Amino acid sequence: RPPNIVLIFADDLGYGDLGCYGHPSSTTPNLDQLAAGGLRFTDFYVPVSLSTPSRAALLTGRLPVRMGMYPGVLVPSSRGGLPLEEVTVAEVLAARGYLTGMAGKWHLGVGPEGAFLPPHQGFHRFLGIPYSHDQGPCQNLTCFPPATPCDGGCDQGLVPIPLLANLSVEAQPPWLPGLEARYMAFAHDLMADAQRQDRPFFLYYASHHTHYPQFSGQSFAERSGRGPFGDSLMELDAAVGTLMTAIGDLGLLEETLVIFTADNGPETMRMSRGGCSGLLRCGKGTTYEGGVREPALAFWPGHIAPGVTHELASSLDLLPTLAALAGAPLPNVTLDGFDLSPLLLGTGKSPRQSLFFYPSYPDEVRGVFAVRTGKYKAHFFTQGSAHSDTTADPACHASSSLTAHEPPLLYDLSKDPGENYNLLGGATPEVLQALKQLQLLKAQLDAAVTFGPSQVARGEDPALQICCHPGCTPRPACCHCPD
Amino acid sequence: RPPNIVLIFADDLGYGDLGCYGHPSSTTPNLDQLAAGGLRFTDFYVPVSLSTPSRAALLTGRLPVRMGMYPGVLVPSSRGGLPLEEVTVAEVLAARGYLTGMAGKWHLGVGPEGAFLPPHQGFHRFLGIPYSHDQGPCQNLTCFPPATPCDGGCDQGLVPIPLLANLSVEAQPPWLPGLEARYMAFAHDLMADAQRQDRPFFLYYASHHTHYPQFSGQSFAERSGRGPFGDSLMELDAAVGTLMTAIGDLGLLEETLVIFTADNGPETMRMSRGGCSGLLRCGKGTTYEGGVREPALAFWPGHIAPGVTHELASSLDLLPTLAALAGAPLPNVTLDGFDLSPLLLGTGKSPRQSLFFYPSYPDEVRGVFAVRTGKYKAHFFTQGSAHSDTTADPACHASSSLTAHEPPLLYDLSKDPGENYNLLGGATPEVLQALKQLQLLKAQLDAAVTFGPSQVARGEDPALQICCHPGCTPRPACCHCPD
Ligand SMILES: *[C@@H]1O[C@H](CO)[C@@H](O[C@@H]2O[C@H](CO)[C@@H](O)[C@H](O)[C@H]2NC(C)=O)[C@H](O)[C@H]1NC(C)=O
Ligand SMILES: *[C@@H]1O[C@H](CO)[C@@H](O[C@@H]2O[C@H](CO)[C@@H](O)[C@H](O)[C@H]2NC(C)=O)[C@H](O)[C@H]1NC(C)=O
Ligand SMILES: *[C@H]1O[C@H](CO)[C@@H](O)[C@H](O)[C@H]1NC(C)=O
Ligand SMILES: *[C@H]1O[C@H](CO)[C@@H](O)[C@H](O)[C@H]1NC(C)=O
Ligand SMILES: [Ca+2]
Ligand SMILES: [Ca+2]
C-alpha cells in the first residue's frame, strides 16, 4: 500500500520568509516543526517565476514552454488552459487507486464549459478559486475581520472571484476571512473518507496564502508581529498544522508523505505586504535565485530522515518522485523531471545535476535564460520585473531591460548564492570547464525543446467569465451570491 | 555557586551566515545544535560596526564614545588603548572569585610596556594576538595547509603578528593553520584547573574566525562547501563543538552558561570570502541592520528554555547580565546596559526598549546616527562604507557620502527589517508618535553623553610594535620566531 501524499503549494512565498529559513519576524511554528522533523531543501527550484507556468510544471512534470503555458499568466476571460492531453500527477495517482483532491487556487485555465477545471484534469473532489484571488474587484471585499478592506482594489472590470465546488459556484465572492476554513474542512473529509474506503488520498492544497491581497481570519488578524503579510502567513502555517493534526488523529502519520513549497518568488512591488527572498537576489518574474529558488520541506516519519539537503531538486521532479512512491506507472510523455525518492528515503543521491530556467515571456530565438549545473549558474539573458520592483537592487526593477550576455555571467552559487560576483568578469580551468558545459547544455536544450502553441495567445472572451447567475444583466457586476 | 560563563566573540560574522540563521551553503553543525538547545536572538545588536569600539563596549558595557574608543580601529603602532580606569566584565568576575581567561583577538590597545594587554584589564591567563590578524604582512604566511598562502598580503610595513602568551611573545608569526588548536588547548586547561580548584571559570573566546585573511587547519581545508570563508567558519564551529565537549566531559553542562555572537557585520569588500548579512542591509562599517545586528545564541541547560526571542538586546547588556548571574557587584560607572537574566531564565521580559547607534567615525555635533525604539528605527544620518563595498545596493558603498535626514528615514523593522520602505517618505498617528519619541531619544542622549578623549588620536609610535627580538635590526622585518 502506497503513502498518503499531501502536496501543499503556497502562493508567492519567498526563500527567506519561513522562520526555519531565517526571517526575523515571520511566525511559522507548524512549518518550522515540520522542517525540524523532516528534510529541508536549500536548493529547490521552479522552472518559471510565475503562477500559471510554475503550477503547470508542478502537475504535468514538464517544462511550461512545451504545453504552451506562456507568455505570462492566464486571466479570467482567457480561452486557453492546461491541455487535457497533458497528464497530471492527479491522473497518474487516480489510476493507482488514489482518492485525489484539490483545495484552492487552480490558475491553469477555465475555458468554455469549464473544460480546464480540476475535475477534468484528474481530481475527484475540488473546492477553490479557478485563478488568483486578486483577479476580480476587491474594493468591497473584506480581507481581515471585522471589516478591514482589501488594499488596492485588485483587478477591475471583472466578474467577482467565484468559489467553485467542482464545476458549480458555491459562492461569489466567497468570504475571505473564512475561505481557509472551508479548505481545511474539505481536506479533513477527503482524508476521512479515503480512510474508511481503505483508499490512499492525494491532497493538493494550493493555498491563496501569501498572494495579494493578504487576508486572514479573526484568529490571526494582528497576531503575527509581521503585519498583513505575516498574518496571512500565520494562517497558512496554521492550515499546515490543522492538516498535520487531522492526519495525526487518523493515525496516518508514518503513512503520510507531506511536501511544502511555493510556486514562485516574492512579489516585492507589494512592499511591506510582500514576501522576502532573503539573501537571494530579486523575486517574482525574474530568473534570479530570489524568483526561482523556493523553500521546501519533506515530511514522512520513518522514511524521511530529519536533516538539510543541498542536493539539486525541482518541482518538475515531484510527479516522478510521487509516482515512484505510489508505484504508479509513469506516462509516455517525455518528463523533464527525475525520481527524488532515493534522496528522500536516504538510499542515494539526487539525479538532478542541471537546471534550466525560462523567463515570464519566452521565445524560441533566445531560449533558456539561465542554466545551472552543480554549483555554477550562467546568465545568458538578464531581465528585470515589475513584480520585483521597489527593491534596493536595480537589477530587479522593470527599468532593467532584457540584456544579452556573451560570455554569460557565471556565478558560483556555493560561495555566492546572492549572485553578486561574476567569475567571467575579467580564467580558472574549473570555471572555464564549467562555462563550456553550461553553454553546451543551453544549446542542446534550445535545439531539442520545441515551444508548444501559446495558450495565452488564444485570446480573451468575456463570455467565459464564471457567473453565479447565468444569462445575467448587467454583467459582470450582476454575478453575485455571497455567504 | 555562580555559573561557568563562556563568552565566544566571533570576528566579522554576518546575520545570515550561520546555518540556523538561513544560509544555503554554510556548514555550522555545532552552532546549530547550540541554537536548537538554547535561546536564539533575532534582534541582538552592537553599538558600533567595527572591531575596536564593539569589543570595547562588550567588555566595559559602556558606549564606545565615552571611553574615547574612536575614531575607527586601533593599529599596531597606536599609543592608545582601552583605559585601565574602565572596569571590564573580567574585572567584575575576578573579584567574585572567577578564574578569568581570554583566548584570541584583543584589539583594545597595546601601548608602551603592554599596559593595555589583557593581564592588566582583568584576565588571569591569556593566549592570542593583540589585534586583528591581518594587521601584519601575510605574503609568506600560510592560511590553509599544506602551503596555500593568505590572499591579499595583508597590512605591509608592519611587524609580523605575534602570539602573546600573557605579556611575552610565544611565536611571531604564529602558524595560522594551527593557531586555533592552541586556543582550544588553553581553554580546556583553564576549565580543568578551575574545576580542580573549586572555582568558576570565565572563558572569553575572541576568535579570529571569519575575519580576513580566512584560514583553517587541514581538517577543514575544502571541507565546508562554501569555500575559504566556509572553511574558516567550519573551524569556528568545530571550536565551539570541542568547547562543548570539554565542558561535557567535565560534567559542567547544566553549570555552564554559553553565549555566542560576532563583533560586527560582514566585510563585503572581501566578496566571496566575506560574510553575509542575509535579508539585512549593508554590512561592516554602516549603521544599517546588516552591520549592527549580529547573531546570538544563549545556552545553559535547565535555565535557558529552547526557543527564539525577538526581544531587544545588545552586547552592552552582557556585562550586567553576566554580573547578575555571578552575583557580582556592579561597578559605580554608568552602564549603558541592562540585566537580561529575566529573559534568559524565562522569568520576565527584556528591559531593552531603545537602542542607539554611532558611526565608525563619530563626532559631538552630529551625535547618534540611528536610534531604535520597539519596532521603529530612525536614520538621522546615513553613510556608506568601504567595508560594505562590492554589493548590489549602492547605499552601502563608500561612494554614498554622509547625508543628513530631516525628518529622519523611519523604518518599521517588524515588517521591513530590510530597511527598504521609509514611512515618513510621503502620517499614521502611531508612526507620528514614534517619530517624536525617536527624535527626543536622540536629543536626550546627545545632550547627556559626552565624548571621551579620542584614544586613536593619541598618535602612532612605531617603537611600540611588539618585537620578538628586543633591540633588533633591521626592524620591523627582523622580528621573528616561527613554530
Ligand atoms: C465533487 O463531486 C463528487 C461527485 O462527482 C462528490 O463526491 C461525493 O461526495 C459525497 C459527500 O459530499 C460522498 O458521500 C460520495 O461518496 C462522493 N462520491 C464520490 C464518487 O467520491 C464531492 O463531494 C464533490 N466535492 C465538492 C467539493 O463539490
Ligand atoms: C599566564 O600567567 C599565569 C601566571 O601569572 C599562568 O598561571 C599559572 O599557570 C600554571 C600552568 O601553566 C599553573 O600551574 C599555575 O597555578 C597558574 N597560576 C595562577 C596564579 O593561575 C598562566 O598559565 C599563564 N598563561 C599563559 C597562556 O601564558
Ligand atoms: C462597491 O463599490 C464598487 C466600486 O467602488 C462596486 O464595484 C461594487 O459593486 C460595490 N458593491 C457594494 C456592495 O457596494
Ligand atoms: C617573503 O616575502 C616578503 C615580500 O614579498 C618579505 O616581506 C618577507 O620577509 C619574505 N619572507 C620570506 C621568509 O621569504
Ligand atoms: Ca505565484
Ligand atoms: Ca570585527
- List strand residue ranges (DSSP E) for B263-324, in order: 296-299, 308-309, 313-314
A226 touches chain B (CB under 8 A): yes
Residue whose C-alpha cell is 494550493: A206
Distance CA B412, CA B372 (A): 10
| Distance of CA A94 from the midpoint of ligand 1 (Å) | 15
- Bridge partners of B296, per DSSP, are B41
Q: Which grid cell is A332?
A: 509516455
B414 touches chain A (CB under 8 A): yes
Whether residues A338 and A244 share a domain: the answer is yes
Distance CA A302, CA B457 (A): 64
Task: State how beta strands B256-262 and B4-10 pair.
Answer: parallel
Residues 6+ apart with CB under 8 A from A83: A67, A68, A455
For chain A, what's the residue count? 483
- Bridge partners of B372, per DSSP, are B355, B377
- What's the domain count of chain B? 2
Three-state secondary structure readout of A175-243: CHHHHHHHHHHHHHHHHHHHHCCCCCEEEEEECCCCCCCCCCCCCCCCCCCCHHHHHHHHHHHHHHHHH
In the chain, the amino acid numbered B280 is: L
**Experimental resolution (Å):** 3.2
| Residue ranges with CB less than 5 Å from ion ligand 6 | B 11-12, 51, 263-264
Task: Tell me if B280 sits within 8 A of B418, measured CB to CB.
Answer: yes
For residue B382, give the CATH number of its domain: 3.30.1120.10
Whether residues B252 and B399 share a domain: the answer is no
B12 touches chain A (CB under 8 A): no
Distance CA B10, CA B104 (A): 10
Distance CA A291, CA A286 (A): 6
Edge-to-edge order in the sheet of strand A296-299: A168-171, A163-165, A125-128, A99-104, A201-206, A4-10, A256-262, A296-299, A40-41, A308-309
Sign, Cα dihedral of B37, B41, B42, B48 = negative
Q: Which residue of A has its CA nearest to B42?
A: A24
Distance CA B420, CA A392 (A): 7
Experimental method: X-ray
Whether residues A360 and A458 share a domain: the answer is no
Distance CA A440, CA A55 (A): 28
- Bridge partners of A148, per DSSP, are A144
Whether residues B206 and B170 share a domain: the answer is yes
Whether residues A439 and A469 share a domain: the answer is no
- Identify the H or E element spanning B437: helix B429-448
Whether residues A303 and A410 share a domain: the answer is no
Q: Which ligand is nearest to the CA of A270?
A: 5
Whether residues B313 and B429 share a domain: the answer is no
Q: How far apart are the first and last CA of chain B?
A: 41
Residue B321 class from Cβ within 10 Å (0-12 exposed, 13-18 middle, 19+ buried)? buried
For residue B134, give the CATH number of its domain: 3.40.720.10
Sign, Cα dihedral of A271, A274, A277, A281 = negative
Task: Tell me if A49 sits within 8 A of A34, measured CB to CB.
Answer: no
Q: Which ligand is nearest to the CA of B165?
A: 2
Inter-chain contact B43–A23, Cβ cutoff 8 Å? no
Q: Which grid cell is A476?
A: 459582470
Nearest atom of ligand 4 to the alpha carbon of B137: 7
Q: Is B184 left (phi over 0), alpha (psi -120 to 50) or beta?
A: alpha
Task: Tell me if A438 sits within 8 A of A410, measured CB to CB.
Answer: yes
- Helix then strand then coil, in percent of chain A rounded to 5, is 25, 20, 55
Whether residues B304 and B430 share a domain: the answer is no
Q: Which grid cell is B282?
A: 549593508
Edge-to-edge order in the sheet of strand B163-165: B168-171, B163-165, B125-128, B99-104, B201-206, B4-10, B256-262, B296-299, B40-41, B308-309
CA distance B24 to chain A (A): 5
Residues 6+ apart with CB under 8 A from A408: A378, A379, A380, A424, A435, A438, A439
Domain that holds residue A419: 353-450
Q: Which grid cell is B350?
A: 527584556
Distance CA B463, CA B450 (A): 32
Residues 6+ apart with CB under 8 A from A96: A2, A200, A326, A327, A328, A329
C-alpha torsion A23→A25→A26→A28, nearest 10: 100
Burial B47-80 (b: 16+ CB within 10 A, else e): bbbbbbbbbbbbbbbbbbbbbbbbbebbbbbbbb
A417 touches chain B (CB under 8 A): yes
Residue whose C-alpha cell is 453565479: A468
Whether residues B424 and B402 share a domain: the answer is yes
Residues from chain A contacting residue B414 (CB–CB below 8 Å): 25, 225-227
Whether residues A82 and A116 share a domain: the answer is yes
Residues 6+ apart with CB under 8 A from A107: A51, A52, A55, A73, A74, A130, A131, A132
Whether residues A280 and A336 share a domain: the answer is yes
| Distance of CA B478 from the midpoint of ligand 4 (Å) | 11
Residue whose C-alpha cell is 549545473: A373
DSSP string, B188-239: HHHHHHHHTTT--EEEEEE--TTSSSP---TTTTT-SSSHHHHHHHHHHHHH
CA distance B274 to chain A (A): 10
Whether residues A170 and A279 share a domain: the answer is yes
- Bridge partners of B93, per DSSP, are none
Q: Is A198 left (phi over 0), alpha (psi -120 to 50) or beta?
A: left
